[PDB]
Design a protein around this ligand. Structure first.
Ligand SMILES: CCCCCCCCCCCCCC(=O)OC[C@H](COP(=O)(O)OCC(O)COP(=O)(O)OC[C@@H](COC(=O)CCCCCCCCCCCCC)OC(=O)CCCCCCCCCCCCC)OC(=O)CCCCCCCCCCCCC
Ligand code: BCL
Ligand code: BCL
Ligand SMILES: CC[C@H]1c2cc3[nH]c4c(c3C)C(=O)[C@H](C(=O)OC)c4c3nc(cc4[nH]c(cc(n2)[C@@H]1C)c(C(C)=O)c4C)[C@@H](C)[C@@H]3CCC(=O)OC/C=C(\C)CCC[C@H](C)CCC[C@H](C)CCCC(C)C
Ligand SMILES: CCCCCC/C=C\CCCCCCCC(=O)O[C@H](COC(=O)CCCCCCCCCCCCCCC)COP(=O)(O)OCCN
Ligand SMILES: COC(C)(C)C/C=C/C(C)=C/C=C/C(C=O)=C/C=C/C(C)=C/C=C/C=C(C)/C=C/C=C(\C)CC/C=C(C)/C=C/C=C(\C)C(=O)O
Ligand SMILES: COC(C)(C)C/C=C/C(C)=C/C=C/C(C=O)=C/C=C/C(C)=C/C=C/C=C(C)/C=C/C=C(\C)CC/C=C(C)/C=C/C=C(\C)C(=O)O
Ligand SMILES: COC(C)(C)C/C=C/C(C)=C/C=C/C(C=O)=C/C=C/C(C)=C/C=C/C=C(C)/C=C/C=C(\C)CC/C=C(C)/C=C/C=C(\C)C(=O)O
Ligand SMILES: COC(C)(C)C/C=C/C(C)=C/C=C/C(C=O)=C/C=C/C(C)=C/C=C/C=C(C)/C=C/C=C(\C)CC/C=C(C)/C=C/C=C(\C)C(=O)O
Ligand SMILES: COC(C)(C)C/C=C/C(C)=C/C=C/C(C=O)=C/C=C/C(C)=C/C=C/C=C(C)/C=C/C=C(\C)CC/C=C(C)/C=C/C=C(\C)C(=O)O
Ligand SMILES: CCCCCCCCCCCCO[C@@H]1O[C@H](CO)[C@@H](O[C@H]2O[C@H](CO)[C@@H](O)[C@H](O)[C@H]2O)[C@H](O)[C@H]1O
Ligand SMILES: CCCCCCCCCCCCO[C@@H]1O[C@H](CO)[C@@H](O[C@H]2O[C@H](CO)[C@@H](O)[C@H](O)[C@H]2O)[C@H](O)[C@H]1O
Lengths: 49, 273, 62, 71, 101, 39, 180, 59, 60, 56, 39, 39, 60, 60, 39, 39, 40
């Protein structure tokens, strides 16, 4: 299975994987901050009356 | 039919598009691919102009008037009888003029000439494109274009000028006018000089570049010389069209007030405010 | 007392007759080189017929 | 990416760089000087709460119109 | 006025023809280019003098001799630059392995 | 004059630089969204 | 067989096709006015209008401009064709009409009209080689010769100028073909 | 990867940078000309205070 | 299939393609931004039932 | 039937054909796009009985 | 100049491509007709 | 020009390039449809 | 640092700099002179509390 | 410091300097002459308390 | 042309010049923010 | 021709004159701020 | 041509004296102007 990496550049691979993860994780967080109402409940906890 | 020296010049090659396919003549005319597209757009545009005359109030040549749409249609195509026809004719015009310039480039390449003529014509196409594409686009409606009619387009020119109260005060227009007038003066001098050395009074020998140079130098104080006068004539004639494009594109999109009150900046320079 | 005919119109047709005369003259001058045309049916002159080719007297010595 | 210094004469890259920064600086200053909020030469001493803010929505009266009636 | 070879870039202080005694790669490049050109320019000027001497046209011989002398003077100016850069090239560590002149 | 080594090396810089730029721009959009969402 | 071209076919508007090397035979953009008078152009005073600058002592380069002599000439294939060794001047309206190039690949000197030379960076800086887009460095060897080296006839002017003009179509086979 | 054989990096790099510089400048000025994102004048408004364009009238 | 690239220079076709797609993408975005329903920079936050719709035919 | 490609070099036809069809498709879309009945960017959701009809 | 077997080979592609395009366009019209008939 | 094997390998990138482009566009259209459908 | 004066001609850069400062200084003075706050030739004798201030935010 | 005159032709500098001072002097005088406070040809005999002052802040 | 020795040396002056500029610019922004925030 | 010693000497004067000019401009801004602060 | 280092110092002394004398005149002018009509 490892032959799939033959002819690649490992620094390209880590560059593509790393950038994909950064994109995906940001998207997933801003989505999840929308659905779960957090940190909106966090802010409302410590907010001033 | 061909000029007595022409035949040896009628080689293949020099096209931009199409290769040998259209690389032939029809009478005097070179055809080429852009010749074919020229005739297409010329024919379609001209017949749609005749159709515009037919559904308008008169066949009188001076009075035919194919008008752009109402401003309410914005950048859309209007109904064809309500100015959409003017829009289709405008696309044909753009296609015909662009095809003409590219056909000129193919002809010049076939003769081993420089590209000066196609690019000089580009100055006129720029002014037309400013009037019907760029300025109406910046104003947000195709209805800002001028109508296609021998005198109705002069009514448009009149009314656009008075939209700015006193269009003579437009500073780019003053430059454009100065180029047009200076061009016509320079053309009269160049024509006169060449003719007067090549057609001297009877029994006089044919003149020379030296006599032309001497006389011109008594007119302006300096020698322009042979290539210099053709550079000047090209600079003046094309600069006139470029400054025309500038003067109309700033009127409306950038300056909206009367043109006389633009000169307020000159009155308020700090040395004499 | 002619209602339709007026001096500006009379002048304008005077000009048109001169101008079409002028275009003819210029097209005669334009044919002093390269004419008559070659054709598979023999020489062609176009219209108007061109003025003859000029011969130019050079400055005798200098 | 220091191989960028192999691709060009460094004297000319500094001339281009200085030009770009100078022009971009003047663009941003005159934009701000033309704004209401950052017209600092006239209003620079105003407090942050006093400085202009662009309206969220202008009002109207139903008979009034900013533009003349059209065709 | 602008100098011929740096032209518009002389407004921004790039001026590689100036007399340089320190080692500088930019001046060395310029000097190698201008030496080859000026050697050829001297070679042309003396061919021109020989031709005009064969024709024997005295005022043309006089000018061709004056032009050759001027062309030699300009070549000497570049050879002076070449040598002073050569002296610096030997000692400044980063400098070229190939001689300048 | 290009070579396959020069090309392959330059490709790595262009790919990594492009992706790094798109990462920084993705954060800029995250900040812009949190301040004033456009949907 | 000495006719320089034939019709591509029998239809009325068809192009001609050259039978030989068109740059040398003078067909299409390489053609010249073959009837043109084989005498020198003359000044108002009757001296030869176009002469090598070496033979008129009043002429000189303008102080601010580059001296082209000694500069290399770079041809259309980017090879060095030669170096400039002389200027020819128009004496009626003072200007440089031709460079004379000593060929690198032979013994000839050939004329090079000023209208075929481009300066690097449009002459704004550099000013240290001449660029000849029209013909390859090999084609310089066939540039038409003048009968003398101190004067040029109106016919020789037409032949030399036509030769460089033809190179924009004929120097490489691809130049004749469309871009798309 | 061989696309870089067909195009000179010294040209490509400037062409790409020129494209991005124009595109970025276009998007900023388009936003600055909008009402919702005229951020120099109104950037301190909260997201509920910021302008929104007109809706469907339903009548 | 790949003999298309033997008929035409791939370099030219890539420049032709990218030019067309860039202009096409710009035109479509401008047409949308210039519309009422899709003027997303001003009205993008409206829900799908509050975004403008062009008028129907009359009832008779 | 194939002999039209001995008259017309196909590589020089196909570039011309693509241009013609690209322009034609753009023209037809814009004619529809600014008609009342087919201005789909603004009234595409209507459904066929509600779409405008150019009666007068 | 192209040979007759090259012309015959191209003709098969050119017919097939044209007819495939016309088939796709006919399906596009079927969808457009179903959504909003013009007659 | 180009060799038929070099054409063969180029085509594979042009195909997968076109496919990746269509894929992103198709997702973008489905997002746009989910936000503000046009039929 | 100082090797920059090998890379550039001192004689030439100084003229470019001195010309730039002259232009910059004059521009800044004329921008101030045409303001209300800093029209110092007319109003320079006003105290700092008394000098003009641009119009504030308060509005209906 | 006199080495500066080796770097620049002093006759070029003196020409550039004297022309700069002449223009600058004239610009300042015409700016002042156009002002209200310093229109000295019409009002130079007014005492320092009588001379015009530009408008202040309203401070209403 | 340019050596790597100069190319690496030069990059060090670029970085320090750049950092100095960015340090000054970011102080200037934070001063401006304290005076009149734009969000 | 120009020695590195002369480049070093000129750098001394150029830096000193630049800094001395910035110092004079600092005193100008101190005086201007005292007369009529702009923030 | 050129200029000698002795010619440079000889010039410089007059140049400084000119500049100083000019600054003195301008200083007296400003003080006369100030005591006539102060601008701050
Ligand atoms: C507004 C103020 C300033 C306005 C400023 C306007 C300036 C206009 C100046 C240019 C106008 C003349 C153009 C021209 O000469 O073309 C060549 C052509 C043919 O002659 P040739 O070139 O010498 O010879 C070649 C020919 O004999 C054989 O060639 P070939 O066998 O290869 O090709 C077939 C033939 C077939 O002939 C034609 O098709 C001729 C059709 C001409 C119709 C247009 C006439 C326009 C007159 C305008 C002046 C005025 C008419 C009233 O030849 C050709 O194919 C030649 C095609 C030439 C195409 C020229 C198109 C020019 C269109 C200009 C439209 C201008 C509109 C203003 O000439 C002619 O056919 C006759 C022209 C005669 C000069 C016009 C004089 C009119 C005076 C008044 C009427 C006199 C009645 C007796
Ligand atoms: C030459 C080195 C390789 C590379 C090798 C690695 C290695 C090895 C690791 C990561 C890791 C990560 N990489 Mg990295 N990475 C590269 C290029 C990138 C690019 C890009 C624009 O090109 C991006 C966006 C990313 C993104 C990411 C994140 C997904 C992740 C967390 C660190 C981070 O945010 O780093 C942002 C990116 C940078 C600042 C530049 C890249 C180099 C720096 C030094 C960061 C990665 C190394 C990290 C500090 C190592 C920690 C120890 C290990 C856990 C044993 N990499 C280059 C091409 N990357 C880590 C991971 O997988 O965590 C889950 C990890 O262990
Ligand atoms: C001559 C070689 C050095 C020099 C050598 C010294 C020495 C030695 C001293 C100072 C001191 C000072 N220098 Mg220093 N200084 C130089 C250039 C400068 C420049 C500049 C724009 O280049 C500036 C702004 C300063 C500024 C300053 C002050 C911050 C400081 C206090 C004295 C003062 O007010 O001086 C006012 C002068 C100016 C602003 C400009 C003119 C600079 C003069 C010509 C330098 C000599 C000043 C010195 C005080 C003379 C008397 C001390 C003797 C040892 C007896 N110097 C030159 C390059 N400077 C003193 C200090 O730090 O005390 C705590 C100190 O002892
Ligand atoms: C740039 C400087 C000036 C300039 C230069 C210039 N014009 C040129 C050239 C050059 C260098 C050419 O090479 C070219 C040429 O070949 O000339 C013979 C041309 C030319 N300048 C022309 C005309 C022209 N130039 C004008 C202006 C100017 N031309 C500038 C002032 C004007 C003006 C001011 O009114 C006119 C009328 C043509 C004779 C010719 C271009 C011929 C051409 O494009 O031919 C193909 C198209 C047709 C034969 C017809 C197209 C028909 C349309 C499809 C339908 C009609 C639509 C149209 C918009 C209606 C307008 C109605 C009007 C009453 C308003
Ligand atoms: C390079 C030279 C080129 C010249 C080309 C010719 C072009 C132009 C010249 C035109 C001249 C026009 C004359 C205008 C005055 C005019 O028309 O006034 C008429 C009387 O009639 C008249 O004068 C009749 C006029 C007749 C015209 C005849 C031919 C032209 C004569 C001049 C030739 C010069 C040659 C040198 C009054 O008109 P009304 O409306 O008041 O009448 C009714 C009142 N209820
Ligand atoms: C708002 O309304 C409207 C506007 C209408 C809406 C519509 C908008 C539209 C249509 C938008 C379209 C966007 C678009 C489409 O393509 C956008 C495309 C964007 C792209 C492609 C971005 C790519 C960026 C890449 C970068 C930054 C690369 C950086 C590389 C670096 C740093 C490394 C440099 C390498 C070196 C130095 C080499 C060293 C080695 C060497 C030399 C060696 O080894 O030799
Ligand atoms: C507003 O309403 C108004 C507008 C007014 C209403 C009116 C509208 C009007 C009047 C419309 C007229 C339309 C019209 C009329 O004809 C339209 C005509 C349309 C036509 C003909 C379309 C033809 C398309 C053909 C295609 C797509 C072919 C593709 C071929 C391909 C892909 C293969 C090529 C070969 C290769 C690759 C070889 C490989 C192997 C090789 C090389 C080897 O093996 O060697
Ligand atoms: C308002 O509404 C209106 C607008 C009016 C409505 C109308 C709309 C209309 C009419 C739309 C028309 C759309 C259309 C067609 O007609 C659309 C056609 C689209 C197409 C075809 C897109 C193709 C995209 C392909 C891409 C992105 C390729 C990317 C990748 C490549 C290339 C490979 C990179 C690698 C290389 C190069 C190295 C290879 C190896 C090498 C070299 C080696 O190893 O040697
Ligand atoms: C408001 O609305 C709109 C405007 C629309 C909003 C949008 C705005 C936009 C889009 C902005 C974009 C900004 C941008 C994007 O990239 C901005 C990018 C900025 C950048 C890159 C700045 C970089 C600065 C670098 C500097 C200063 C380096 C200086 C180096 C020096 C001094 C050292 C010189 C060498 C020396 C001393 C010695 C050598 C020794 C040698 C050789 C030896 O010793 O041998
Ligand atoms: C309205 O407000 C808007 C405009 C909108 C707001 C925005 C404003 C903006 C963007 C402003 C930008 C400002 C800026 C940015 O860089 C400003 C930068 C300014 C700079 C760098 C100034 C530098 C000055 C340096 C000087 C004066 C040096 C003098 C040197 C002297 C005297 C010595 C010369 C050498 C000698 C004597 C030795 C010879 C020896 C020899 C020969 C020998 O030894 O032989
Ligand atoms: C560390 C600093 C060292 C000294 C730095 C000196 C800086 C001098 C001023 C730099 C800015 C001048 O302004 C900058 O000039 C360059 C000169 O090519 C222009 O560059 C552009 O125009 C010029 C002509 O003007 C063209 O010849 C050139 O090919 C093109 O790139 C930039 O468009 C402009 O922004
Ligand atoms: C408003 C315009 C500018 C106003 C500022 C004027 C300058 C004010 C401070 C001047 C202080 C003395 O400044 C100092 O002069 C000496 C020579 O005397 C220069 O000395 C320089 O030349 C000498 C040789 O002569 C070198 O050995 C030395 O390395 C070099 O720095 C210093 O570089 C400079 O720092």
């Amino acid at each position: 299975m490892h032959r799939i990496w033959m002819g690649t550049d490992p620094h390209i691979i880590m560059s593509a994987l790393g950038s994909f993860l950064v994109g995906a994780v940001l998207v997933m967080h801003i989505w999840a901050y929308g659905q779960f109402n957090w940190p909106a409940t966090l802010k409302a906890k410590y907010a001033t009356p | 039919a061909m000029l007595s020296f022409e035949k040896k010049y009628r080689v293949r090659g020099g096209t931009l598009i199409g290769g040998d396919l259209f690389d032939f003549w029809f009478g005097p005319f070179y055809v080429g691919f852009f010749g074919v597209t020229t005739i297409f757009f010329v024919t379609l545009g001209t017949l749609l102009c005749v159709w515009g005359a037919a559904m308008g109030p008169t066949w009188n040549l001076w009075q035919i008037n194919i008008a752009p749409p109402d401003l309410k249609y914005g950048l859309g195509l209007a109904p064809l009888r309500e100015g959409g026809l003017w829009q289709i004719i405008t696309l044909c015009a753009l296609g015909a003029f662009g095809s003409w310039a590219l056909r000129q480039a193919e002809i010049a390449r076939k003769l081993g000439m420089g590209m000066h003529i196609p690019w000089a014509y580009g100055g006129a196409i720029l002014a037309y494109t400013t009037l019907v594409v760029i300025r109406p686009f910046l104003l947000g409606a195709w209805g800002h274009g001028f109508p296609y009619g021998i005198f109705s387009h002069l009514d448009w020119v009149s009314n656009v000028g008075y939209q700015y109260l006193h269009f003579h005060y437009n500073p780019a227009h003053m430059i454009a006018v100065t180029f047009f007038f200076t061009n016509c003066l320079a053309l009269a001098m160049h024509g006169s000089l060449i003719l007067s050395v090549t057609n001297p009074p009877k029994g006089t020998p044919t003149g020379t570049s030296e006599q032309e140079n001497v006389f011109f130098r008594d007119l302006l104080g300096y020698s322009i010389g042979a290539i210099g006068i053709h550079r000047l004539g090209l600079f003046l004639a094309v600069g006139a069209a470029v400054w025309s494009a500038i003067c109309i594109v700033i009127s409306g999109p950038f300056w909206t007030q009367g043109w006389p009150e633009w000169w307020n900046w000159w009155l308020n320079l700090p040395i004499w405010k | 007392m002619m209602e339709y005919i007026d001096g500006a119109q009379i002048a304008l047709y005077a000009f048109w007759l001169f101008f079409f005369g002028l275009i003819i003259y210029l097209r005669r001058e334009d044919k002093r080189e390269g004419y008559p045309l070659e054709s598979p049916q023999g020489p062609r002159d176009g219209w108007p017929k061109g003025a003859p080719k000029k011969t130019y007297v050079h400055r005798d010595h200098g | 990416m220091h191989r960028i210094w192999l691709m060009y004469d460094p004297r000319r890259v500094m001339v281009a760089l200085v030009g770009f920064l100078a022009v971009l600086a003047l663009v941003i200053h005159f934009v701000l000087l033309s704004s209401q909020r950052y017209s600092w030469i006239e209003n620079g001493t105003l407090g942050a709460d006093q400085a202009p803010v662009g309206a969220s929505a202008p009002a109207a009266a139903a008979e009034m119109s900013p533009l003349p009636p059209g065709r | 006025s602008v100098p011929v070879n740096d032209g518009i870039w002389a407004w921004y202080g790039i001026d590689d023809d100036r007399p340089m005694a320190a080692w500088s790669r930019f001046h060395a490049t310029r000097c190698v280019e201008q030496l080859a050109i000026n050697r050829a320019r001297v070679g042309a000027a003396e061919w021109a003098l020989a031709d005009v001497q064969a024709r024997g046209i005295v005022p043309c011989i006089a000018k061709a001799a004056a032009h050759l002398a001027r062309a030699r003077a300009e070549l000497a100016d570049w050879e002076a630059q070449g040598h002073r850069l050569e002296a610096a090239r030997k000692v400044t560590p980063g400098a070229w392995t190939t001689p300048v002149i | 004059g290009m070579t396959e080594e020069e090309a392959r090396r330059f490709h790595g810089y262009m790919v990594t630089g492009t992706l790094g730029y798109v990462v920084v721009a993705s954060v800029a959009h995250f900040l812009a969204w949190s301040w004033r969402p456009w949907f | 067989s000495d006719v320089k071209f034939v019709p591509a076919d029998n239809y009325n508007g068809s192009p001609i096709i050259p039978t030989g090397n068109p740059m040398i035979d003078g067909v299409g953009p390489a053609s010249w006015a073959e009837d043109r008078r084989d005498e020198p152009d003359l000044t108002y005073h009757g001296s030869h209008k176009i002469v090598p600058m070496r033979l008129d002592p009043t002429f000189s380069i303008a102080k601010g401009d580059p001296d082209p002599r000694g500069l290399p000439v770079i041809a259309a294939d980017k090879q060095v064709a030669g170096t400039v060794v002389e200027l020819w001047v128009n004496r009626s309206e003072p200007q440089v009409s031709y460079y004379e190039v000593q060929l690198a690949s032979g013994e000839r000197r050939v004329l090079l009209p000023t209208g075929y030379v481009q300066w690097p960076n449009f002459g704004l800086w550099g000013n240290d080689k001449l660029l000849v887009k029209s013909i390859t460095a090999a084609q310089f060897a066939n540039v038409p010769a003048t009968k003398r080296d101190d004067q040029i006839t109106l016919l020789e002017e037409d032949k030399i100028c036509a030769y460089y003009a033809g190179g924009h179509m004929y120097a490489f086979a691809e130049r004749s073909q469309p871009i798309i």
